Amino acid sequence: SAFANLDAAGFLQIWQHFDADDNGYIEGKELDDFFRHMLKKLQPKDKITDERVQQIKKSFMSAYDATFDGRLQIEELANMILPQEENFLLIFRREAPLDNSVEFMKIWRKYDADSSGYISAAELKNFLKDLFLQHKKKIPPNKLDEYTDAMMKIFDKNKDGRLDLNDLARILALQENFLLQFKMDASSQVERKRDFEKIFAHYDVSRTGALEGPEVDGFVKDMMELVRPSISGGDLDKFRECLLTHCDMNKDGKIQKSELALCLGLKHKP
């Protein structure tokens, strides 16, 4: 029902369908179909007609741009469809792909030891340095500076001297992002947090502040099946393994409340 814009992740999923060889352009003829894909992604239960694809396509660009025949470079189409922040993320992910979320979380923990869901904004350049090292990616010092500066502009608007995990996780180049798995809107974080506390408490019968074994399986089924009603059984296994891959420190199979909150885009304050 509500209006939704494509984010950089979704834009890239669609783009790849049309530009499988990563030439960095599509032909203007594919532009109708690009919009049809976009509408199916954003409005999954809507029945998309030809007339709707034209009307929505025209809503995203000038009259003149709608008439354009030739190659549209990725940056050109991104400039039409994506807001600034998402535009930046699309470009950054293409020029400096960082695809290891396990190493990301390791570095996250170095800078956010108590799992608050924030790092000190003064630590951003060092955090990015560490992140590029864990990816075995050498970048020029001047790019490091440019990236730090660009990210401060988009992520430290709150200017309280903290950067949110929900923001910095988005700099990763993943086909489908491990954390950004969730709806991030105003009363979506309130409702998810209320559900989180109820369900975590339900399963933590021993009151130890961690879940393990059946408690984790239970928690995942229940949390997920209200976040995404009718979630396939395979996808519950996937997310369960994502948690184990990211939040299972020692080989013990225990998931702390604080770590579970972070995976859900939440913050646990003890």
Rounded to an integer, what distance in angstroms lies between the CA atom of residue 182 and that of residue 232?
16
Question: Would the annotation count 126 as a binding residue?
Answer: no
67 among annotated binding-site residues:
no
Q: Is 33 flagged in the annotation as binding?
A: no
Exposure letters 60-74 (e unless 16+ CB within 10 A, then b)? bbeeebeeeeeebeb
Name the region of 100 (left: φ>0; alpha: ψ -120 to 50; beta: rest).
beta
The reply to whether 208 sits in an annotated binding site is yes
Number of other CB atoms surrounding residue 134 within 10 Å: 15
**Is position 146 annotated in a ligand binding site?**
no
Concatenating the DSSP letter of every residue in 86-122 gives: HHHHHHHHHHS----HHHHHHHHHHH-TT--SEEEGG
Is 158 annotated in some ligand binding site? Answer: yes
From CA 153, how far away is CA 84, in angstroms rounded? 11
Does 30 show up as a binding residue in the annotation? Answer: yes
Q: Is 191 annotated as a binding residue?
A: no
Is 166 annotated to bind a ligand? Reply is no
Residue 204, marked binder = yes
Residue 72's DSSP bridge partners are: 26
Please indicate if the annotation marks 147 as binding a ligand: no
Q: Is 212 annotated as a binding residue?
A: no
156 among annotated binding-site residues = yes
103 labelled binding-site residue: no
215 is in an annotated binding site: yes
Which residues are part of a known binding site?
Answer: 19, 21, 23, 25, 30, 112, 114, 116, 118, 123, 156, 158, 160, 162, 167, 204, 206, 208, 215, 248, 250, 252, 254, 259
Which residues are part of a known binding site for Ca(2+)?
Answer: 19, 21, 23, 25, 30, 112, 114, 116, 118, 123, 156, 158, 160, 162, 167, 204, 206, 208, 215, 248, 250, 252, 254, 259
